Ligand binder design. Structure first.
Ligand SMILES: O=C(O)c1cc(Cl)c2c(c1)C(=O)c1ccccc1C2=O
Ligand SMILES: O=C(O)c1cc(Cl)c2c(c1)C(=O)c1ccccc1C2=O
Ligand SMILES: [Ca+2]
Ligand SMILES: [Ca+2]
Ligand SMILES: [Ca+2]
Ligand SMILES: [Ca+2]
Lengths: 115, 114, 114, 115
């Protein structure tokens, strides 16, 4: 699988477990089409979202449902969700990890792209 | 009531001339254009909106990070940063949306004051 | 020439009353006390030093994050944040050391201007 | 092993490989005593630093040699190193991951503490 998502919780110092994640691919008419989705595991990771054959070049959006995550923990959040928008580009063999570190009023995201 | 500040984590400097587009969710659930501007030499974008215009709603602040890096000769990973939040639900607040940029990573924080 | 700004990522607010201790590496390779202060209501700490006092050197800015969280009733992970850098090596610069705090995580950024 | 270190590079979007990491434990006289050290692997991870028997409660410092990392990549850095200082506390079974995300003028660090 060429696309994985990993989510951490900066308040509790833990993987962010059971977070809903939706991936969209930008269509020709500029709308966002559902592409893959799931919930993070007990390790905060979401594997198996797509396959090499399905994951073609294009613009993708990863939407992480942070508001529901914080609400399930009883913590007051700022954002509706965290959004990560990027172009997939075929520069030799590549695997993409979209990582996010969550706080109630802040988040960070990094792309780890490896061969 | 809405200010945006952007920093560059490679240079340790304000991120100057970053385009920012703000949208507000309309009644038909689409993103309507709300305001736009660019960061100044200090990395700050003031004057996007007014107290009258900045009503309750769900807002999206799109920070055009790819255009920023490309103008510096760098090919970055992300298209833009997208900060989405419900504003003013318990009355007017002042929002500072801050972003810290690297070519393959960014962080964003909200400072909300009364 | 040296300012420290601290934000709280749980509240989306300035981190107020954060103690900050600055040290400078002495000729015997030990950390000598250089300056200290606390962040104001804006989360900013001004007036730590002067242009005359802030000579070249290796400086350590210790931000007392554990004391901050404990005063808010929270048990955090880190003892403090420690920002270590060589200053003024190519002439005087102005340094802003920023920190963004959560109970189990923090980030720190330097904004350096001439 | 109860203590692992993971380092990512925010400029290149990659694990931070071959980064020197030194762990110290605070001694009774308030000095920092060497405790463990190593270099991150091709995955940006440093495993096997210590054992359950050696890793007692106390105050620890993890020093990540970021300046040498950036210099090996030809990139101008701000910090001498990144320093992570924390108390280890025996609250049931615990494993500690100290994660760091590096940029030339900024770094972030998070603690992932799991059972
Ligand atoms: O108050 C500000 O002018 C301000 C603006 C930004 Cl953009 C940042 C900060 C402050 C800040 O403390 C900060 C701290 C740690 C990581 C990123 C940032 C920022 O990115
Ligand atoms: O799971 C990991 O091995 C791992 C290591 C690091 Cl170092 C990071 C992350 C994950 C991660 O999700 C992450 C998310 C947002 C900002 C920084 C990081 C990291 O810096
Ligand atoms: Ca291509
Ligand atoms: Ca309302
Ligand atoms: Ca010099
Ligand atoms: Ca104990």
């Amino acid at each position: 699988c060429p696309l994985m998502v990993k989510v951490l919780d900066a308040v509790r110092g833990s993987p962010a477990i059971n977070v809903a994640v939706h991936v969209f691919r930008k269509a020709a008419d500029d709308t966002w089409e559902p592409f893959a989705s799931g919930k993070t595991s007990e390790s905060g990771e979401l594997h198996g979202l797509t396959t090499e054959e399905e994951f073609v070049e294009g613009i993708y959006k990863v939407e992480i449902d942070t508001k529901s995550y914080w609400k399930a923990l009883g913590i007051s959040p700022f954002h509706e969700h965290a959004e990560v928008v990027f172009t997939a580009n075929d520069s030799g063999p590549r695997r993409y990890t979209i990582a996010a570190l969550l706080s109630p009023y802040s988040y960070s995201t990094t792309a780890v792209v490896t061969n």
